[PDB]
Amino acid sequence: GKGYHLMSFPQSAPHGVVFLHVTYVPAQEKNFTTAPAICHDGKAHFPREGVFVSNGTHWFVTQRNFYEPQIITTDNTFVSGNCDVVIGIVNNTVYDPLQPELD
Amino acid sequence: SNLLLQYGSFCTQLNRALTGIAVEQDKNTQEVFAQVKQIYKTPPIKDFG
Amino acid sequence: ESNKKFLPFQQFGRDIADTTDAVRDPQTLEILDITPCSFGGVSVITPGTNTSNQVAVLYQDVNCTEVNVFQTRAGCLIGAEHVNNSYECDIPIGAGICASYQQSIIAYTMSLGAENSVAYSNNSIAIPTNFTISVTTEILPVSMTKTSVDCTMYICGDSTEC
Amino acid sequence: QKFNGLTVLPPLLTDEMIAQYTSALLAGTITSGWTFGAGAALQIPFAMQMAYRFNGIGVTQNVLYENQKLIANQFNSAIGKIQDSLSSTASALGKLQDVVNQNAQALNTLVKQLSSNFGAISSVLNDILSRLDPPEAEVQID
Amino acid sequence: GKLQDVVNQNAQALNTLVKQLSSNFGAISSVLNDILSRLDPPEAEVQID
Ligand SMILES: *[C@@H]1O[C@H](CO)[C@@H](O[C@@H]2O[C@H](CO)[C@@H](O)[C@H](O)[C@H]2NC(C)=O)[C@H](O)[C@H]1NC(C)=O
Ligand SMILES: *[C@@H]1O[C@H](CO)[C@@H](O[C@@H]2O[C@H](CO)[C@@H](O)[C@H](O)[C@H]2NC(C)=O)[C@H](O)[C@H]1NC(C)=O
Ligand SMILES: *[C@@H]1O[C@H](CO)[C@@H](O[C@@H]2O[C@H](CO)[C@@H](O)[C@H](O)[C@H]2NC(C)=O)[C@H](O)[C@H]1NC(C)=O
Ligand SMILES: *[C@@H]1O[C@H](CO)[C@@H](O[C@@H]2O[C@H](CO)[C@@H](O)[C@H](O)[C@H]2NC(C)=O)[C@H](O)[C@H]1NC(C)=O
Ligand SMILES: *[C@@H]1O[C@H](CO)[C@@H](O)[C@H](O)[C@H]1NC(C)=O
Ligand SMILES: *[C@@H]1O[C@H](CO)[C@@H](O)[C@H](O)[C@H]1NC(C)=O
Ligand SMILES: *[C@@H]1O[C@H](CO)[C@@H](O)[C@H](O)[C@H]1NC(C)=O
Ligand SMILES: *[C@@H]1O[C@H](CO)[C@@H](O)[C@H](O)[C@H]1NC(C)=O
């Protein structure tokens, strides 16, 4: 079928078979502005699974197939290198969750 | 041609088979290319990184 | 009136598969081409006896001067008013031309669909916020009717002398 | 190629409208990716579209970004050799020429059978009639 | 329509198979019990073939 497959059900027919394909069509898309990586504390941050999305002022991490924004932490990004080789990187603060417990 | 009709309907079958595959060659091109309902266009600015 | 160049001892020409093409008449030594009289099938375009009874007629690759006369690339279309629009339609004719019934039968050039210029920018994304469940069918034939035919009862049918 | 009772119908889709689909697919994948195989149209910058596609084959996306300049150059040169490999070869389209050479060749040998006796006095129909009489002509004709 | 075309082709081939039994094919008559009923054997053997 057309879309992302979920399941199918068979039905008989006089000299053939009939399938009922259950799928996805994602709908009601809203466009944002993105960035490939984020430079915080002099190192580049990439999303583990998802993308960096900006509403205009703030930056979040969402799934690529459904809008569910989350705060950018170190639990959903992985660091790789310094923020100089990536082109298109932006500036933002990565909320480390260990510091507030210690502080 | 008066003698030809004595062979029943051999002419009809031959014209039906050839017309039976003249249609498919139009169906084959449809299934391959015609998979988008909407004609997308590249933007005037081509900056793909 | 031909353009060929016969050597002055040759009478007639045969280009491919021994079909005569140019025959020089034996009185003015001029080469005259020969092309067969135009033929081709005749297709009747109907909108269904339920909706109406008007019909167009198409002549397969016959030039209209040799027969509401519209000269398509696929032949001569008689009875269909060629309009300057484009619709996705029902009756296919050929060379990108289709005809349909909308109080008359008229012809088009097929339109492949809507025009989209995706708002592509090098720092913007479009993420869905909702979804839909879509259930669709798919018909597939799996087998056809069994048949066994007796040769002798067919050819002869109870006649030992045959 | 109308010679003797033979017709060549035209294809329903002209080569101009076929070339409109393939430009509709090319303009689709390079501005969205796979999102048209599954519904509506969603933009994506081609730099991150390829970052999704390194994840698919098991390479972390930081490889692409740190090497985007090299990847673009390797891709641009790879297309450069595609045109050379076909515009100067012997026949890279040997699959398509075989289709053309079989329909034409199998049609010529259909025409060339029009000049065979099959056991009649002559291969031309109008000469059996002009030099014979009806009652036994039908034996030759059949 | 995909499953219908299968039935519409098989029942159509059979009908043209049966309709081919009622053609002279160049004999006196299309019925086999008439040639046998009005010719001697050494000349009916020609029409049967
Ligand atoms: C994106 O739109 C606005 C941009 O200001 C966001 O609204 C603010 O967001 C921050 C954190 O998200 C809050 O602390 C503020 O209280 C909000 N202020 C106002 C005036 O709205 C909004 O949160 C963002 N949208 C989503 C869905 O997160
Ligand atoms: C992102 O943050 C860093 C730090 O504020 C910025 O790096 C500075 O860039 C300017 C211009 O080249 C230099 O003069 C500074 O020396 C840099 N500071 C440091 C600590 O390295 C960077 O410009 C910011 N980028 C954006 C778009 O805001
Ligand atoms: C065959 O006969 C015709 C006439 O019957 C010839 O045509 C004449 O040719 C001369 C010289 O070219 C012209 O002056 C005349 O005007 C032509 N008369 C007519 C009626 O056409 C022709 O030349 C002869 N050709 C051969 C090979 O003998
Ligand atoms: C996603 O789409 C569905 C419809 O397909 C929305 O469901 C409707 O929601 C409103 C109230 O929220 C109800 O009045 C309607 O009865 C629901 N069904 C229809 C057909 O309208 C749903 O709200 C959407 N969800 C989001 C987050 O946008
Ligand atoms: C995007 O386009 C603009 C101008 O074409 C350019 O300045 C910028 O560097 C590009 N890349 C980004 C924002 O990542
Ligand atoms: C044959 O058709 C073409 C256009 O389809 C036209 O130019 C030409 O006049 C026609 N030939 C004759 C003898 O009318
Ligand atoms: C279609 O033919 C020309 C081409 O633009 C146009 O000027 C004309 O208005 C159209 N004719 C009709 C009947 O719509
Ligand atoms: C972004 O918003 C809408 C989606 O609601 C989309 O149709 C539109 O084309 C986009 N606009 C721009 C400037 O990209």
Any overview of this molecule?
Chain E: This is Spike protein S2'. The structure is cut from a larger assembly and holds 5 copies of chain A. The first copy, chain A, has 103 residues and is mainly β. In chain A, 5% of the residues lie in helices and 53% in strands. Chain A contains 1 helix and 10 strands, in the order ββββββββββα. Chain A has one helix at 98-102; strands at residues 4-13, 16-24, 27-35, 38-40, 43-47, 51-54, 59-63, 66-70, 77-79, 90-91. At the B-E interface, loops of B face loops of E. The site of a molecule of 2 linked components (NAG-NAG) has 2 residues of chain C, from strand 13.
The helical percent of chain A reads under 10%
Largest sheet of chain A: 4 strands, antiparallel
Any ligands, ions or cofactors bound here, and which?
a molecule of 2 linked components (NAG-NAG), 2-acetamido-2-deoxy-beta-D-glucopyranose
Find the structural class of chain A using helix and strand composition: mainly beta
Beta fraction of the residues of chain A? over 45%
Shape, principal axes of CA atoms of chain A = elongated
Integer-rounded radius of gyration of chain A: 21 Å
Distance between the termini of chain A: 54 Å
Largest interface: C-D, 30 and 33 residues
Strand order of the largest sheet of chain A: 3-6-7-8
Oligomer: part of a larger assembly
The total beta strand count of chain A reads 10
Task: List the secondary-structure elements of chain A in sequence, H or E.
Answer: EEEEEEEEEEH
Continuous helix count of chain A: 1
Protein name (chain B): Spike protein S2
